[PDB]
Amino acid sequence: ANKVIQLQKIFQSSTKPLWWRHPRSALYLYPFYAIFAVAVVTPLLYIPNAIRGIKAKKA
Amino acid sequence: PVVKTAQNLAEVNGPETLIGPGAKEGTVPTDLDQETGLARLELLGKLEGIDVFDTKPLDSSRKGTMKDPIIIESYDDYRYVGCTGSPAGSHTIMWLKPTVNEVARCWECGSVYKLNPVGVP
Amino acid sequence: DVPTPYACYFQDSATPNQEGILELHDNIMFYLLVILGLVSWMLYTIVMTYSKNPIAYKYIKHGQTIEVIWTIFPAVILLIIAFPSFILLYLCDEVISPAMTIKAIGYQWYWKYEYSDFINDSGETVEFESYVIPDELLEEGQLRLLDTDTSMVVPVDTHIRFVVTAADVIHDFAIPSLGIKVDATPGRLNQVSALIQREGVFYGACSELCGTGHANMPIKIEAVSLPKFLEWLNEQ
Amino acid sequence: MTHLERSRHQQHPFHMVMPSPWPIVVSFALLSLALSTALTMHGYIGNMNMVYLALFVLLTSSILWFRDIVAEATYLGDHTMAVRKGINLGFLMFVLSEVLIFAGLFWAYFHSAMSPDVTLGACWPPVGIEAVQPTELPLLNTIILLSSGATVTYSHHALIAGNRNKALSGLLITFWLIVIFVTCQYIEYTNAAFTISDGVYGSVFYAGTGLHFLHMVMLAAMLGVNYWRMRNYHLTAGHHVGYETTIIYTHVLDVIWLFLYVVFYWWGV
Amino acid sequence: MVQRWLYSTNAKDIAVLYFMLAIFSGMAGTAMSLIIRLELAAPGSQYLHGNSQLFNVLVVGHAVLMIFFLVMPALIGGFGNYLLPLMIGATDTAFPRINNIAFWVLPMGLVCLVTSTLVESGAGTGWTVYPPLSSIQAHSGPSVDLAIFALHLTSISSLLGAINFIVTTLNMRTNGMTMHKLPLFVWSIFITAFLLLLSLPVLSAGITMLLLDRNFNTSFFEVSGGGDPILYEHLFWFFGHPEVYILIIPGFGIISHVVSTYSKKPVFGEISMVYAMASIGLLGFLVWSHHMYIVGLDADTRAYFTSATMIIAIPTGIKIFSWLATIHGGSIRLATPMLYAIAFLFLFTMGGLTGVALANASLDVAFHDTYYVVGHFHYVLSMGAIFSLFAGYYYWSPQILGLNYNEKLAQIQFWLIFIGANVIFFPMHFLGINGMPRRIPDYPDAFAGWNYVASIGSFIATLSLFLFIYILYDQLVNGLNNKVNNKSVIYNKAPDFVESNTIFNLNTVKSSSIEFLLTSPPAVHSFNTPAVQS
Amino acid sequence: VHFKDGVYENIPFKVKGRKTPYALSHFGFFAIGFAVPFVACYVQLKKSGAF
Amino acid sequence: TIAPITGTIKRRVIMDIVLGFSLGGVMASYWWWGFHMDKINKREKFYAELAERKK
Amino acid sequence: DEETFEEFTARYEKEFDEAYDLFEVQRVLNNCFSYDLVPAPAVIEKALRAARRVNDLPTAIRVFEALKYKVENEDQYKAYLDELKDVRQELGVPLKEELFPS
Amino acid sequence: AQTHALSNAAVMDLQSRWENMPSTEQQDIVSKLSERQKLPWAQLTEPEKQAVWYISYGEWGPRRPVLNKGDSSFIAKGVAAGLLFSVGLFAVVRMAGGQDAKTMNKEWQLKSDEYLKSKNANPWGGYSQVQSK
Numbered sequence A: 001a002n003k004v005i006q007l008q009k010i011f012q013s014s015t016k017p018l019w020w021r022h023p024r025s026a027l028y029l030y031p032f033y034a035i036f037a038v039a040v041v042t043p044l045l046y047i048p049n050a051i052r053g054i055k056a057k058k059a
Numbered sequence B: 001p002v003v004k005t006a007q008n009l010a011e012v013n014g015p016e017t018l019i020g021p022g023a024k025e026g027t028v029p030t031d032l033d034q035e036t037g038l039a040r041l042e043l044l045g046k047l048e049g050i051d052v053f054d055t056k057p058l059d060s061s062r063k064g065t066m067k068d069p070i071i072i073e074s075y076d077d078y079r080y081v082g083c084t085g086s087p088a089g090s091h092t093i094m095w096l097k098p099t100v101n102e103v104a105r106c107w108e109c110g111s112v113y114k115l116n117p118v119g120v121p
Numbered sequence C: 001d002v003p004t005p006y007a008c009y010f011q012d013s014a015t016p017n018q019e020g021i022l023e024l025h026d027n028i029m030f031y032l033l034v035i036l037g038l039v040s041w042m043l044y045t046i047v048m049t050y051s052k053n054p055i056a057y058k059y060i061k062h063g064q065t066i067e068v069i070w071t072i073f074p075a076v077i078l079l080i081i082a083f084p085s086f087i088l089l090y091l092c093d094e095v096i097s098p099a100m101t102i103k104a105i106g107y108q109w110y111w112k113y114e115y116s117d118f119i120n121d122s123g124e125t126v127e128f129e130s131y132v133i134p135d136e137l138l139e140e141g142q143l144r145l146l147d148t149d150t151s152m153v154v155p156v157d158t159h160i161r162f163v164v165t166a167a168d169v170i171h172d173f174a175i176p177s178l179g180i181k182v183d184a185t186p187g188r189l190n191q192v193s194a195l196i197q198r199e200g201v202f203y204g205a206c207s208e209l210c211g212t213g214h215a216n217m218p219i220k221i222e223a224v225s226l227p228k229f230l231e232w233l234n235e236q
Numbered sequence D: 001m002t003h004l005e006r007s008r009h010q011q012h013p014f015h016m017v018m019p020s021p022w023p024i025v026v027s028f029a030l031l032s033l034a035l036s037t038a039l040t041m042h043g044y045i046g047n048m049n050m051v052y053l054a055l056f057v058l059l060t061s062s063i064l065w066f067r068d069i070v071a072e073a074t075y076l077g078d079h080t081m082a083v084r085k086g087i088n089l090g091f092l093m094f095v096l097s098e099v100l101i102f103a104g105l106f107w108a109y110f111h112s113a114m115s116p117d118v119t120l121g122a123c124w125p126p127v128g129i130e131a132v133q134p135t136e137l138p139l140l141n142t143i144i145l146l147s148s149g150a151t152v153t154y155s156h157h158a159l160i161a162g163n164r165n166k167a168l169s170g171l172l173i174t175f176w177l178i179v180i181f182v183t184c185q186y187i188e189y190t191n192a193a194f195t196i197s198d199g200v201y202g203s204v205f206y207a208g209t210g211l212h213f214l215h216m217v218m219l220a221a222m223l224g225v226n227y228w229r230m231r232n233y234h235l236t237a238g239h240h241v242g243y244e245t246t247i248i249y250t251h252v253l254d255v256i257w258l259f260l261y262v263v264f265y266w267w268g269v
Numbered sequence E: 001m002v003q004r005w006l007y008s009t010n011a012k013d014i015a016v017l018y019f020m021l022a023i024f025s026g027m028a029g030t031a032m033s034l035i036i037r038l039e040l041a042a043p044g045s046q047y048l049h050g051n052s053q054l055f056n057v058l059v060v061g062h063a064v065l066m067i068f069f070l071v072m073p074a075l076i077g078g079f080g081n082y083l084l085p086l087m088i089g090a091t092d093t094a095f096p097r098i099n100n101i102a103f104w105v106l107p108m109g110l111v112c113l114v115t116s117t118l119v120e121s122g123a124g125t126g127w128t129v130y131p132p133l134s135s136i137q138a139h140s141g142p143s144v145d146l147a148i149f150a151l152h153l154t155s156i157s158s159l160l161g162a163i164n165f166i167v168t169t170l171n172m173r174t175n176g177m178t179m180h181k182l183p184l185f186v187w188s189i190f191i192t193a194f195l196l197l198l199s200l201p202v203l204s205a206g207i208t209m210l211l212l213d214r215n216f217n218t219s220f221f222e223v224s225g226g227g228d229p230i231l232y233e234h235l236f237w238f239f240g241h242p243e244v245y246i247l248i249i250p251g252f253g254i255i256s257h258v259v260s261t262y263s264k265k266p267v268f269g270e271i272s273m274v275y276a277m278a279s280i281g282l283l284g285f286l287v288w289s290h291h292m293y294i295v296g297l298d299a300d301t302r303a304y305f306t307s308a309t310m311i312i313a314i315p316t317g318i319k320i321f322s323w324l325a326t327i328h329g330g331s332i333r334l335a336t337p338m339l340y341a342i343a344f345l346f347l348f349t350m351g352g353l354t355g356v357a358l359a360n361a362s363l364d365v366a367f368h369d370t371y372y373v374v375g376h377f378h379y380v381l382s383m384g385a386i387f388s389l390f391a392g393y394y395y396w397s398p399q400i401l402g403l404n405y406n407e408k409l410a411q412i413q414f415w416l417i418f419i420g421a422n423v424i425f426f427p428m429h430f431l432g433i434n435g436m437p438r439r440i441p442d443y444p445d446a447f448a449g450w451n452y453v454a455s456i457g458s459f460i461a462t463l464s465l466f467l468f469i470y471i472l473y474d475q476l477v478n479g480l481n482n483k484v485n486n487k488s489v490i491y492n493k494a495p496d497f498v499e500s501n502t503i504f505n506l507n508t509v510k511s512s513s514i515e516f517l518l519t520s521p522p523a524v525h526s527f528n529t530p531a532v533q534s
Numbered sequence F: 001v002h003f004k005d006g007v008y009e010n011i012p013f014k015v016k017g018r019k020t021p022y023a024l025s026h027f028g029f030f031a032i033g034f035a036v037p038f039v040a041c042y043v044q045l046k047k048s049g050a051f
Numbered sequence G: 001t002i003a004p005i006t007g008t009i010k011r012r013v014i015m016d017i018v019l020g021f022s023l024g025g026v027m028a029s030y031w032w033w034g035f036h037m038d039k040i041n042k043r044e045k046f047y048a049e050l051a052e053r054k055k
Numbered sequence H: 001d002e003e004t005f006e007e008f009t010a011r012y013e014k015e016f017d018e019a020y021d022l023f024e025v026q027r028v029l030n031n032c033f034s035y036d037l038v039p040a041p042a043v044i045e046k047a048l049r050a051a052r053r054v055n056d057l058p059t060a061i062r063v064f065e066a067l068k069y070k071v072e073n074e075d076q077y078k079a080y081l082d083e084l085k086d087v088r089q090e091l092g093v094p095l096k097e098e099l100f101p102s
Numbered sequence I: 001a002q003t004h005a006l007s008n009a010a011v012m013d014l015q016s017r018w019e020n021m022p023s024t025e026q027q028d029i030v031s032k033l034s035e036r037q038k039l040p041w042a043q044l045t046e047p048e049k050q051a052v053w054y055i056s057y058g059e060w061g062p063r064r065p066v067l068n069k070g071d072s073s074f075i076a077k078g079v080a081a082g083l084l085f086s087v088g089l090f091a092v093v094r095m096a097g098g099q100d101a102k103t104m105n106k107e108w109q110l111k112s113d114e115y116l117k118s119k120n121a122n123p124w125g126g127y128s129q130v131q132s133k
Ligand code: HEA
Pocket: E022, E023, E024, E025, E026, E027, E030, E033, E034, E036, E037, E059, E060, E062, E063, E064, E065, E066, E067, E070, E071, E074, E125, E126, E127, E128, E374, E378, E381, E382, E385, E386, E389, E390, E393, E421, E424, E438, E439, E440, E441, E458, E461, E462, E465
C-alpha cells in the first residue's frame, strides 16, 4: 500500500547491515539461520559412514 | 524542522534530501516520485541537462609545458592520467599519477599535468 | 613388432598402413623441424643480442610486410604437410575386397577372436578367448604383460578385415606394429583393413581405459604362412 | 551544483555492494544439496528429506539475496543507468547460457534420432513407443504461451503509458496463463504412454520438456514477484529492470518452446 | 576480519582467495602426480599394492586438480579478478556477490571431489568421464556422482566469473577507454569469458545426462536402450577443446605484458593480437572432433577436422612471431618473469608443433591414447599455463603485496622447474611413439628406461615447487627487508641510456597500464575520481 | 566500507604480530595440501589389504 | 662529412630470419636424409632379401 | 607516415632548440636515439648545445657514449667524433672512455 | 658563482663510497657540483667530472643490475645442488619401495631375446631387450 518512501527513509538511516534494516528481518533471519546450520551440519556427519561403507538401514 | 525534496539540482544538500513523495493512491510511480539517492541525483542532472558522473576524455589538444601545465580537476589529492600525445593517439599510452605536490611528465611527449583538487572531504 | 628398451622411434612396420603413416610422420617432422629451428635460432640470437642493448627501438610497432609474410607462411606449410595427409587418409580408408574377415570382441579385461569366415569341423565358426598370462604363471622367457594365453594366428600376405566391437565398455583394438588402432564401442562395429607383409609376432595393447584390468589386456597377432595357417585352423 | 555538494557523492555511477553473507551461504547450501543427493541416490541416507531440506535452504538463500537486491534497487536508489545496463546485459548472457544448454539437449535428440540404433527398430520413435499426439494438448500449450507473450507485452506498454489497472490485469492474466501451461504439462506427464526410462526417445523427450518445465516454473515465480512489486508501487513508469528481465525471459522461453514443439512433435512423430 | 573475507565484495580480496585456493589445489595435484610418477617408475606394483583402481583415481584427481582447480582459479579467478578492474580503471567489478559465490563454490567442489576419492572405490574413469565405464554398471558408489557435482560446481564458478568479466569490461570501462584501447590481458580475459559462456552449457548438459543415466535408470548413453557413448564424447569434447584454449589464452595475455615491459618496447601488432585471440577462440569450437578420430568417423569428417585443427596454427603462429618481433630490438632485462616468458615461447612452440603433428587424422591412428599425447598436452598445458602463472606472479606480486621476493632463489627455481619439466615430459614422446598406451599403471618392461628418467624429472620439478613455497615465505616475511637490501629487483624497468638517476627517481614508473601506477598494496577501493585517458 | 590498507593488510592471514611462528602455518597449509593424496591412498589401500 | 647511416635493424632482421631458416633446413635435412633414409634403406634391403629367399 | 632523414634532422634540431630544462633535453635525446638510424652530426650539435644550455656535463658525455653504442662500426664512430672535434673542444666535454682511462 | 673548487677530501673516490654516505652529504655534494656546472666545462677538474658522471649515470640505485656480480655462480651452484638432492631423494625413495619385477633379469631377458629371434621380430630395427643386469 505504497510504503516505498517510508521504507526508503528507514533504509537510508540505519546503522545495521542491509539485510537487518527491515523491521521484519529477524522473523526471516533467525529460522533461516537455524535451518541452514542444520542442513549444512547434517550431510557431513554421513561422510564417515560413506567412507566406512555403512549404508543407511531401510527401517 | 523538515528538509525539502531538492526540486532541482541546485537544492541538493546531502543524501537525505533526495527522497521525494511517492505516488498518490492508485497511479504508477514516476521517476521523479520515488527515485532516491544516486539514481535520483543522476535523474535530476538529466532533467536540468548537467551530466553528472563526468565521462569526458583527457585534454589532449596542446602539449602542456611546465610553465602552463595541463590542469586536471580532481576530488582526491591524486589522479591517474593516460596520455597518448599532442594529437589523440600520437604515441603509446603513458600512465601518470599527478598529485598535489608533484606534477606528472610523460617522458615521451613531455606533457606536464598539474592537479587541482575539489577537496573538502 | 615388440617394444625395445630406450627406443625413440616406431616399431618395425609389417603393413602398408604403418609404413605410410611413418613416412607421413617423417615428412611432417621435416617442416616441424625447420620451424622449430627458425624459432629457436631467433630466440637465441635476439636474447643474446638485445640482453646487452642499451637503447630499445621503441618505435617499431606494425611492420605490415613481415605481418603478411608470417600470416601466409604457416598456411602454405600446412597445405604442404596436409596434401600427403589427405592422400594417406583416403588411401587407407578404402576397403578393397578383403580375402579374410575376422571379429575381435573386447570383454572386460580380455579379448575374444572369432574367425567367422572359416571352419573348425564343418562350417562352424572358430573362436577363442585371449587371456593375458599371469605373472605367477609366466615361464622364464615370456614377456610380462605382453604375451597372452592363446595367440591370434593370421595368414601372411592376405587382406584381412578386423571387425572390432565390445560388450561392456569401450575397448580399443590397437596394434602399433601393424599400424591399426580402432576403438570398440558396445553399440556399433568398427572395421579396419590390414595386410601383413612378413611373418612373426606383433604385440599391442588396449588404447582405451576400461577399469582395473586395462593394463593387463594385450593383443598378440602371430602372422604365419598360409599352409601353416590352414593347418592351425584345422587343428583349432 | 557547487563543489561542496558534489564532493559528497559517489563520483561514478557504479554500485558499491555492501558485504553480504548470501554468496557463501548459497555456496554452503549448494554443497549440502550435492552431498546429500550423492549420499541418497546410493542408499547411504535412508530417506529423501535431507535433499528437500537442502533445496529449501537454497531457495530461501536465493530469496534473501533477491530481497537484498530489490532493497538496493528500490529503497537505496543505487541502480543508476550504468548499473541497469550491466544487469540487463548479464541477464542476456545468462539467457544465452540457458539457450546453449537447450541446444545441447537438442543435439542429443538429433543424434539419437538421425542415426537410430539397431536395437530401437531403425525408426523414430522406436518400435513399442506411441508418441504423444501434437495437436491435442501441445497445441493448447503453445497457443496459450503465445497469448501470454502478447499479454505481457500489452502489460509492459500499459505500465510505460502510466495506466496501473491495465498493467496489473495483463501481468496477472499472463501469470495465470503460464501456471495453466505448467498444470497442462504436468497433466500430459501423468497420462503418458512412455516414461523417461523407456529408452533414448523418452530420455531426451522428457529431458528437454522437463528443463522447459523448470524454466516455466522459474518464469512464473518471476511474474509473481513482479506482480507483487508492481502492486506495491515498487515499479515506476520508467525504472524497471526485473520486469524487462522477465519479459525477455518470457519471449526467449516462448521461442525455445516453439522450437521444442516443432522438433519433438512435428518432426519426431 | 569475517566481513572482509567471508562476506567479501571487492575483487582484490576474492582474487587473493582464488590464488590461495589455486596454489593449495596445485600442491595437491602435484602430490598426486608425484605418486603417479613414482609408482610408474619401474614395472611391477611398487608403491601401490596392485590396485589399478587407485592409480586411475589418482590420475583423475591429478588432472582435475590441475585443470579445474589450479589453472582456472589462478588465471581466470585470481589474475583476472585482480587486474581486469585495475587495467580498465573500474572501481570494483560488477556483480560482486556473484564474484564471491564463484570462489566460494570452488572449494566445495574440492570437498566433494576429495570425498569422492575417499568413498567406496573412487572415480577411475579418467578426467574424461566416458561411459559405459562411468555408467552405473562399471562404477558403482557415489564417487562418480561426486566428481560430476565437483565439475558442476566449478562450471557454475567459471560461468558466473565469465558473465562478471564480460559485464565489467563492457560496461565499467573508464571514461577514456574505447574497446580498441584495452590492454591485451583484458582482451584475453574477455575472449576467454565468452569461450566459457559458450562452452560450459554443453558440458553441463552432457554431464547431467550421464548422471541421470547413472542414477535415474534413464538411457542417454546406455547401449541397452538405444544410447551411444559417442554422443557423450561429442558433448564433452565440444566443451573440452575450448576449455584448453580457455586455459591458454590468459597465458597469452600475460606473456604479452611481460614481454612488452621487459623488452621496453610495445607489443608488435596489438590489434593483430586481439584478432588472433578472437580467431583462436572462434576456431576452438570447430575442431572438437580431433580427440575422437578413432571412434570410426567417416573419411570426409576426419578430412574436414584435420584441416580445421591445422588452421589454428596460423593465429598461434602470428602470436608467437609477434612476441619474437616485440623482443627483437629491445633492452632485455632478464628478470625472472622474462625468463619464464622466453621458456613459454620455446616450449609452447614445441607443444604446438607436436599438436600439429597430432592434428592429422592419419598420424592420430598411431598416436591416439599413447604417451605422445601426454607429452603434447603436458608441454602445452604445464608450460603455457604454469610458466605463465609463474611469470604473472613474479611480475605482479610486488605490486599486489607490497613485498618483494628474492631474485636469486627465483632464478634457481625457474631453472630447476625448466630442467625437471623437460626431463619428465620429453621421454614421454619416445614412449608414445614406441607404442606405450596411456592410463596404464603397469607397462611391458621394455618401456621402463624412459619411465625411469621421467620419474627423476618430477623429483626436480616438485623440488622447485618447494623452493617456490619457500620463496613465498621469504617474500611474506622479508619483503620489506628485500626492498631495503640488494637481494631483489625493485624496478622492472631500468633508466634509459641518456636518463640520469634523479630524472628516473622522479619518474620511476613508465608503464602502459594503470596497475603499476597504484601504490603499495592498492587501496580497498581505488579510482575515487575516475581515471582519465586520451 | 573502510578496511585497513598496508603491506600486510591485503591478505587473509596474519604474519607480523603472531603468537606461533608464521612458518608453522605457512608450511602446514601446503603440507596438508600435499598430504591429501597420501591420506586418500592410505584409505584406499586400507579398504583393500595392507596399510 | 657523415653519410646518413640507417636501416641497420631491418638488415639485421632479414639476416637473422634467413639464418634461422638455414639452421632449420640443415636440422631437417639431417633428420630426413640420415635417419629417415636409413630406416627406409634398411626396410627395403630386408624386404629385397625376403623376396630373394622366397625364390 | 614515415619520415625521411632530412625531415628527421630538421625536426630534432627544432625539438632540441625548444628544450627548456634537463628533463626535456634528456627526453628529446632519448627519443632521438630510439630510432633505426644514428642522428646526424647537426642533431648531435644541437644536443650538445642543449646540454650546455641547461648546465649538465654528464648528458653531454652520454651523447657520445650513446653514439658509440648506436653506430655500427668502430670507424664511423671515429668519423663522428673527429668531425665534432671543434665543438667538443669548445665546450670542453670529455669522452667517457678518455675520462675514465682503463 | 660558487667558490674555487670542490674539496678533494669530499670528492675523491666517489665511486667506492657514494652509497655509504648519508643523504644530507649526498644532497650537499650534488648542489655544490650543480653550482660548479654553470662554469665553463674546461674549468672543472677531472675528479669533479668523474664524480658528476658517477652521480648521474653510475651503476647504483636505479641502475643496480639484476645480478650483482656474483649471482651467476650462485644460481649455477643452486641448480646443481637441487639436481643432486633430487636424484638423492629419488634413490632413497626407490630403496624404500616394493621389489623389482621378476622379469628384470639378464637371464630372463636373454631367453626373451632368443624367443624373439625365433619369431624374426623387429628384423631391421632392434628386438633385443636386456636393459638390466
Ligand atoms: C593443469 C594441468 C596439468 C599440469 C600442470 C600437470 C603436470 C604434471 N603431471 Fe599431469 N595430467 C593432466 C594435467 C596436468 N598435469 C591431465 C588433464 C591428465 C590426463 C588424465 C587422464 O588422461 O586421465 C594428466 C595425466 C598425467 C600423466 C599421464 C598419466 C597416465 O595417463 O597414465 C602423468 C604421468 O607422468 C602426470 C604427471 C604430472 C607431473 C609429474 C607433472 C609435473 O609437471 C608437476 C610439476 C608441476 C608444478 C610444480 C606446477 C606448479 C605448481 C603450482 C601450484 C603452480 C604455482 C604457480 C602459481 C601458484 C602462480 N599427469
